[PDB]
Amino acid sequence: EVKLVESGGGLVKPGGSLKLSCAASGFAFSTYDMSWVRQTPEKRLEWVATISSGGSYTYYPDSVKGRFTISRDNARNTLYLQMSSLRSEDTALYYCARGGPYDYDGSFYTMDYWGQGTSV
Amino acid sequence: NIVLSYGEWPEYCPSPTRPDVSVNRFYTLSTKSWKTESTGWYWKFPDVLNDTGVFGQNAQFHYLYRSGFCMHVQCNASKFHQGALLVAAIPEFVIAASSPGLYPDFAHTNPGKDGQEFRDPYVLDAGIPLSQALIFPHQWINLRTNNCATIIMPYINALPFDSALNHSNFGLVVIPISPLKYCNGATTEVPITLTIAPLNSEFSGLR
Amino acid sequence: GFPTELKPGTNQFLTTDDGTSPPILPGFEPTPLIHIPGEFTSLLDLCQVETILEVNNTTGTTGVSRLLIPVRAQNNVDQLCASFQVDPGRNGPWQSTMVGQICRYYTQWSGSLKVTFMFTGSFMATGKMLIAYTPPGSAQPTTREAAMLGTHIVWDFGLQSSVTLVIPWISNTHATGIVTIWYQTNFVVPPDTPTEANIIALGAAQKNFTLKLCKDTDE
Amino acid sequence: EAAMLGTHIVWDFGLQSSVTLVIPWISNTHATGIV
Amino acid sequence: VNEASVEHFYSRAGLVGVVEVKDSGTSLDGYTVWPIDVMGFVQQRRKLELSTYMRFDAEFTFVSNLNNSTTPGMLLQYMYVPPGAPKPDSRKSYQWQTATNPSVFAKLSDPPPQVSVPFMSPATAYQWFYDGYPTFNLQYGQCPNNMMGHFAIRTVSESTTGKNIHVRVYMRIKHVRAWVPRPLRSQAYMVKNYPTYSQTITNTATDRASITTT
Amino acid sequence: DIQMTQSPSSLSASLGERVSLTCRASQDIGSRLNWLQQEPDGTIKRLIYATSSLDSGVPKRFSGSRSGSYYSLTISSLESEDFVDYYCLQYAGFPWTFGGGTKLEI
């Protein structure tokens, strides 16, 4: 199964850094292009960030565009996401799932399997 | 299954230093990891050898030059691996910039013996579309049938002899059309090897 | 021939003419002609070379992923995989083929085409596909068992990894064929093998292709 | 890339499972090859 | 066949540049120099950029007239500055007399003058794509062996005449032989002399709703 | 962003009724619209991909459909374990926006 699990969240003062882990297994975490989705307190899932299938390309929406820094271990089977100087209205259940505009043979697993979601 | 470009073996210009199997050996460059996110690579024709062995001494310490090549690409892939490459030799491959700064960097027009990864392989980095790249000499690398592609390229230029450190005749592009895929528990980076062998080379204007 | 009267059409300049003119540099000896490899003397020989069709041309699909037809596992039998009209010179998947561009530099054309398909899945992956062609008269068939009674070729990509569908005739003078790819069987794989492959279509023009009335293009 | 410009043999063990590297000459009278 | 050949594909002489002999108002030049350029209009460029090496001689016609279509008796001089001769710099300039620069002395009210420029190139054929640097960023892919010359046009006068003369240069490609076909340019032409395109890629084929709809 | 949004912010039907939740896109998004089902507190599962095809495990009661600019989802007979939130997601507009919600009641 595509078993993804998010962990590493919690409270933090406005202005700082707080990473996030999406260590997943049960599937080849070296060919799928993953991404991060945020579920705000208003129950409105907004796109947060994405990462290519090899951790080389990245599309940052207007939500961060310079603040959040995604990555990909790809060897310890983990997914990173930075929260550098998070804004005030930035609390959400940061889900992580598959799907990415890269990986030409995509558009099929676009957020197919999801994680669990850790609060902040 | 050696695609003889334009049906012309490289030949000696009839009657210059004409080297032999000392320089006409098989230069095996470094391998390149083919991943799923991979976009492609390209190597210029004589620029890929201008700093490799004897050919790097005969090219820099001279003034005129002409030679064919025997580009030969192989992919050491498994049987549970899937994907497809398009290995084409592009005469007068001219790289273009991408304005939102107007001229290509020198690292992108003469990448050396490492090749430069494509930034927009859909347009071959030269405006022209990749879909029509098959009009050039080419050979498919489809991992389900074969993992080898040999291209024999003659000397294609206007003047008989030309410089070797300034004018790079063609460029061997290698672009994955169908991206690589594999289930968990496999070599996550199929290696791609490239072998070069100058054929019927000549030189003039020593030092 | 001393006395002559000027018949009409004098002092006129007709662009599309093969008249003569004086050489502005007599005696000049231009650079001689050395044998450069790879001369093409006809655009027909350029059309007959296979290039890729953007069969996946769809709103949203960007990049090179427009040249790929997704053949996946959980696509039940008799379902439809892809379809594209046979019209080299109308806006569609043929617009990225050497024929689809040259045919836009002309006004009329008529001949036979060909669409070579190529499977790019694992070696262990087996299955079967139905590739049916519909003449210009009819419309796109609605079911697999409706296209089997046509002009098709069943394709077992596990055995043979590439086929060719020769179009008999496509003439543009004044309602065009359709090619559909049907899931004949399922997509079966052994364990530890990806369950999503791609088909790559390549289009060309057979040796009976003709062009007429050259004209400018619409980019 | 420093040894490719020598006397080598590229070995694709997936295709051919055994090769031979013939040493040209090794004389001991008085500074030896390396593989 | 015989209508898709490369010899016919480049026929039917077309306008390669509209030059103007500004002579009235605040532009009392009286002359103008037009550097011979084939890739002046995108339509002709995209066609010429289908092949890599091409060899052809050209016939140039000059359809000149005033700015109200009237063709008076005004005399004109069409001087062909060869590839490597100094160009004129004024209405009254020594260059207008050099016997090595062939001139054509025709009037506005005469059949358009028609000359035939030969294949003027050091190399064997013209090179539209020259991968490499000349003069062994502002120099990549600029071959200097493609210059065909210059056409300097002036009204043979002493003082300012006060009449702008618009000239329409028409070029016909003869004896053409092309080499090494290339894919036709798909992206726009963001700048001349370079293959530079823009970031926002434009898909070659038009986008439909679904893959299975006709 | 294309801003594909669902019209019913909240609906209520019976255990044998046939709900019809829509998602009206603004620009041309093509057949690249998915449906994500969210538990009351758990993760978000997928129902439809490419607007038509069920997932590998989704029941037969769910089904997708397309109609111009009115991408919609319709459940067959509204069995149990359905009065949860619903979302529509498209991956054509590169910002990859979402809709609202269709939390069903009874």
Side-chain angles (χ1 to χ4, degrees), chain C residues 28 30-44 46-53 55-69:
Chain C
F28 186 86
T31 316
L33 191 46
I34 83 170
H35 166 48
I36 308 178
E39 173 172 8
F40 68 106
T41 175
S42 159
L43 296 205
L44 299 193
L46 299 202
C47 298
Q48 307 185 4
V49 172
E50 300 209 37
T51 79
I52 306 184
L53 306 96
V55 191
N56 199 11
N57 51 329
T58 34
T59 291
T61 288
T62 169
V64 61
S65 75
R66 298 170 74 85
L67 312 166
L68 303 168
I69 307 177

Side-chain angles (χ1 to χ4, degrees), chain C residues 81-89 91-165:
Chain C
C81 190
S83 45
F84 59 91
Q85 310 197 49
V86 173
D87 53 351
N91 309 35
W94 283 88
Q95 218 186 302
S96 90
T97 296
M98 206 70 174
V99 182
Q101 299 286 335
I102 283 184
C103 291
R104 292 176 85 84
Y105 272 137
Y106 282 79
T107 308
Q108 302 156 21
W109 56 89
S110 64
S112 325
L113 310 181
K114 70 160 171 178
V115 194
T116 292
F117 292 93
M118 177 178 312
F119 186 61
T120 78
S122 163
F123 177 89
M124 315 288 315
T126 318
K128 212 179 296 288
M129 301 284 286
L130 183 71
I131 292 162
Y133 161 72
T134 308
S138 162
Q140 183 186 17
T142 325
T143 41
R144 186 207 68 82
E145 75 212 42
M148 177 257 303
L149 293 85
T151 316
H152 66 78
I153 169 185
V154 70
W155 182 25
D156 193 325
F157 49 62
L159 208 162
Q160 164 198 11
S161 282
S162 198
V163 292
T164 316
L165 174 68

Side-chain angles (χ1 to χ4, degrees), chain B residues 6 8 79-84 122 130-132 134-135 140 142 144 155-158 160 177 179 181 183-184, chain C residues 34-35 37-38 49-52 64 68 96 98 101 119-125 157-158 161 192-194 200:
Chain B
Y6 305 107
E8 292 199 20
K79 204 172 292 299
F80 297 90
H81 273 153
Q82 68 172 30
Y122 181 42
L130 156 73
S131 42
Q132 322 187 27
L134 281 71
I135 192 51
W140 285 91
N142 190 20
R144 81 173 284 106
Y155 182 71
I156 297 169
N157 194 82
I177 309 304
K181 278 287 183 296
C183 264
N184 180 23
Chain C
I34 83 170
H35 166 48
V49 172
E50 300 209 37
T51 79
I52 306 184
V64 61
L68 303 168
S96 90
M98 206 70 174
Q101 299 286 335
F119 186 61
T120 78
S122 163
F123 177 89
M124 315 288 315
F157 49 62
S161 282
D192 294 299
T193 295
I200 290 174

Side-chain angles (χ1 to χ4, degrees), chain C residues 176-191:
Chain C
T176 38
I178 307 96
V179 169
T180 52
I181 319 177
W182 293 96
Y183 275 88
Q184 165 67 92
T185 64
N186 201 16
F187 188 79
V188 67
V189 300

Side-chain angles (χ1 to χ4, degrees), chain A residues 93 95 115-117, chain F residues 40-44 84:
Chain A
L93 291 94
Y95 289 95
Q116 272 185 50
Chain F
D41 52 7
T43 192
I44 319 159
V84 287

Side-chain angles (χ1 to χ4, degrees), chain A residues 18 93 99:
Chain A
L18 195 167
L93 291 94

